[PDB]
Write a protein that binds this ligand. Structure first.
Ligand code: PQQ
Ligand code: PQQ
Ligand code: CE
Ligand code: CE
Lengths: 577, 577
């Protein structure tokens, strides 16, 4: 989109969830820096009027801030010229409350998109809705997903050219993952790109994986599955999307291949679950695809963000894609072709020795691959991954990445799964605990990571998983939140905490930074705990069954989350003086 | 209670809702003052995990802060030694959710009491519950009110000696208002004092009103009503209680006399509705009582706080009771006898010329007394009163009062009412609007008032009603919140605002100030709009019928409250540094 390509360069605005199409989450603003951040204080706050998990973050376009909430997905426009703000408009969609019963991982929403004088939102119950950005008037609404089939929507849509790109959730409900493109003006569906099934549904361009046939090709959407198991094939698309306008490719990752009992998927790779896709936005046709975790047996969803830095590789400036996967590996690919440049662990990994440079496949440790009817113990990372959806940042100044991570392991036993449309299609008993096979007394870490060297530069051990995507700035600072409510600013060179404040609820939002109409720098973040690790608190679940929430309940209680935080939903905005 | 008499003198703690038994809401702390308050900033916050109206405030006892919420009435103990806090324990009572449907005026609760190692809470559904203050363990509980008869509890209980005093709500449901005294050590109900009915139920001491028999006497609880109309007689007890241990008297006010159609109560004063009671704590027996509004036709509940200052009256130090009634008059009584010393308007009043010096009865303006089947227009104040429950403060240094006020008027038409147990028993159509018979463009004011002179000293006009009870301090400051979310510090001498910050939701909490274990002064307040004026927002009500919420919906939309604030539930704590 030509407006967004222009606007995303402005230091004073924040026009899409991860700052720009490259998903760098980097701001050039330097009013707030390592010298003065100790003086940072709350400027103002705003209640979203919702409880449970508040993921994503606000947008700032012009002099208007756009705010979104957990279910029922209230949307607000705040006029920042009104000292400090006034509510310009609000919108709450009508939804089918049955959506709540088929949300796997809390009733979260990762946020709004802006383009062409319009705001775009997704709803838990499967709608994509366009609103007038200045009045809040509903312009069009479309049904993209079907709650009666166990589908929900939690991901933020992406506007590219005249299309709004919308995903789906339900990898634990046997859903056929896909991305739909809807016309920005009418909402009419233009194309629908599936993550499995026949080529006609997957949508492959004539040059698909041309340079890397070893990454797969035509027919693999069915041939790499037993029978018609692909019809329940997962590969959902609830993460963050990115875009390179020069290459005319947009990028995203896909979820686990449906049932968690790999026995019922045996015989093939189960493509294109756990896959990085690069597609043409006009047609949806794939130019390349790389499957990170063939025949997944761990729930290592591949949906984490696809950051698009230009890195110096073997002495030459190279258009890269960088992705910190649930499977614990930090991948660097050539974003033109899907060529694997590097893959090294960014957390402790014990299910695989390495990713092979020969065939780009994981070299598995067989004792850590799961199976039906027999437990597999001490798998690291757990299903929540080296990190979950919480997006990393990249600084072009340092050339390094700032990554929120999990530090947890699990036991995982496959169980026969039976499909009933609208009900869970899992087939696993999972127990979760702290990192390094339960030896660690902490469950998270915030790190600085060198993707090409495949090494951590520094690490901040955090008691709880870090479920907040940092913003990094030219002031030498990274901001992120903790699940017990601390909002922190750290020195990007050393990891030292330079400022912190305890807010009302665990933070699972991704902070932003922008300039107000007063030309002053502000830092804004949601508070309101939830998401998968926070499900025991958000859904008020008891400790009696530690297997509940597919392991999430036990581990949250072990880490002491329910004693550490209440539910909430508040936007906090900070500035100097 | 001897512990509370001792503790209430400590500058660093806040051991009951209005600071002390005299309900002065005054703190001797002066770390924060007129010279430095501009430097005040948020220190920390805590989400209550509930939405809708958050009335009252936290308690600070020792190094523990006790926090309460709107329905379902979560209770938390925060350990303030844990930099800045940790959740020490929490308790959520089991309730009958039918209570929500019979709450007149939002699902608020005015807060906790502390005494003798115990926390005492009330629940919307009619329970009084004693918890261990250090562990949160339930010690005892009793059913005090019955939701099937339209009873709820929203008021904060008061501990006096070895008794916890518990009121009831339901003046709009034909409830028989009463106060119960429960043994703090066992939960046994020791006595139960009704606001109407025969003397055996009202409970009168042998010297009742002996100095002022013109204020009423034996038998008036039935003889001042037509037939047995007293059986649906209201006089509920949902406001703030006060106590003078030197006099062995506790004090409180009573609600409207049930049906809003005065025609059905014609024939007498309807005692003891709209009444100030002084009762013996041992027996519940009344020593004196003064009815402010005989034969009410306006819903002028008498429940507002009974502040117990010692004032110089005609040169003599006098133990006074000062009360800013819903009816718009600022009453000063001798708290030994119920002598009426002074009564003058603290807001614009047009329903009465004055209170008679001859017999202490309002001199009514007949045109403004409401009637059955005919509309009466331009009545000031409206039923929300000169002020509602939001409690005023008194400074012993200045000898003046700092009062949050409403600036609103109404039309009110009596309608014949039919009693159905558990259903509303109102009988009125009420249209509300701004002050001075709808001429004004603002709906509230924060004032400094001289009670003996009967004069405002200064006034700050506020766009919304001021539904927040100030804390006033020896630093020369008054702190209060507005319904569009501004928390403000004013210079008590000039009435100038010296500091303000916009928070996430309208403030209907009453702020407190205390010393942390770090010896630093903090100011704390709930944010989370609701209560009667906020009902359109708290209950998500449309503007279609302006008469809805007994007039509250119309006036809240006219004032623009739904455009100004969202719902919430957050405790904000401020300090210097
Ligand atoms: O397979 C799926 O469709 C799907 C959807 C979602 C979601 O929509 O939030 C999550 C996951 N999987 C998942 O595996 C997981 O780790 C997870 C965490 C969260 C969260 O917001 O905290 N959502 C999801
Ligand atoms: O007569 C009653 O029993 C009763 C109860 C309550 C309550 O319990 O909150 C209010 C009132 N009346 C009332 O008249 C009124 O002005 C009012 C305002 C509020 C509030 O919290 O904002 N409660 C009540
Ligand atoms: Ce999944
Ligand atoms: Ce009332």
């Amino acid at each position: 989109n030509d407006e967004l390509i222009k606007l995303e360069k402005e230091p004073g605005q924040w026009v899409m969830q991860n700052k720009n199409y490259a998903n760098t989450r980097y701001s050039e603003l330097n009013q707030i820096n390592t010298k003065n951040v100790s003086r940072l204080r709350l400027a103002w706050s705003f209640s979203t009027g919702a409880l449970r998990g508040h993921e994503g973050g606000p947008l700032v376009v012009g002099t208007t801030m756009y705010v979104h909430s957990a279910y029922p997905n209230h949307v607000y426009a705040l006029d920042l010229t009104q000292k400090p703000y006034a509510i310009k408009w609000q919108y709450t969609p009508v939804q089918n409350s049955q959506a709540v019963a088929v949300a796997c991982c809390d009733v979260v929403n990762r946020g709004l998109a802006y383009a062409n004088g319009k705001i775009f939102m997704t709803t838990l119950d499967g709608q994509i809705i366009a609103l007038d950005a200045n009045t809040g008037k509903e312009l069009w609404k479309m049904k993209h997903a079907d709650v009666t089939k166990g589908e929900t929507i939690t991901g933020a849509p992406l506007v590219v050219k005249d299309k709004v790109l919308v995903g789906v959730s339900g990898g634990e409900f046997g859903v056929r993952g896909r991305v739909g493109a809807y016309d920005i003006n009418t909402g009419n569906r233009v194309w629908l790109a599936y993550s499995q099934g026949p080529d006609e549904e997957v949508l492959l361009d004539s040059d698909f994986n041309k340079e890397f046939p070893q990454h797969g090709g035509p027919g693999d959407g069915t041939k790499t599955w037993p029978g018609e198991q692909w019809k329940l094939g997962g590969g959902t698309t609830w993460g963050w999307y990115s875009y390179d306008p020069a290459l005319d490719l947009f990028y995203y990752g896909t979820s686990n291949p449906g049932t968690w009992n790999a026995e019922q998927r045996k015989g093939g790779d189960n493509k294109w679950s756990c896959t990085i896709f690069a597609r043409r936005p006009d047609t949806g046709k794939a130019r390349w695809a790389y499957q990170m975790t063939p025949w997944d047996s761990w729930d290592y969803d591949g949906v984490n963000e696809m950051i698009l830095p230009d890195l110096t590789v073997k002495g030459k400036k190279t258009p890269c894609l960088v992705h910190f996967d649930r499977n614990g590996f930090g991948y660097v690919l050539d974003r033109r072709t899907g060529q694997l440049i590097e893959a090294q662990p960014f957390v402790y990994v014990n299910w695989a020795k390495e990713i092979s440079k020969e065939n780009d496949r994981p070299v598995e440790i067989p004792e850590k691959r799961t199976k039906q009817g027999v437990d597999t113990k001490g798998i690291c990372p757990n299903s929540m991954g080296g990190k979950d959806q919480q997006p990393a940042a990249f600084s072009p100044q340092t050339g390094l990445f700032y990554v929120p991570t999990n530090n947890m392991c699990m036991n995982y036993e496959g169980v026969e799964a039976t499909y009933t449309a609208g009900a869970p299609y899992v087939g696993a008993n999972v127990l979760m605990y702290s990192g390094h096979e339960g030896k660690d007394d902490y469950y998270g870490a915030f790190i600085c990571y060198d993707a090409l060297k495949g090494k951590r530069v520094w690490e901040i051990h955090e008691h709880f998983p870090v479920w907040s995507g940092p913003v990094v700035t030219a002031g030498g600072l990274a901001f992120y939140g903790t699940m017990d409510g601390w909002f922190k600013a750290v020195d990007i060179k050393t990891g030292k905490v330079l400022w912190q404040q305890k807010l009302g609820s665990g933070i699972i939002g991704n902070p932003i930074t922008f300039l107000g109409p007063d030309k002053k720098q502000y830092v804004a973040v949601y508070s309101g705990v939830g998401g998968w690790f926070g499900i025991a608190v958000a859904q008020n679940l008891p400790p009696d069954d530690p297997y509940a929430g597919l392991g999430a309940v036990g581990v949250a209680y072990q880490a002491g989350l329910p004693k550490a935080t209440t539910v909430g939903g508040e936007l906090y905005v900070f500035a100097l003086e």
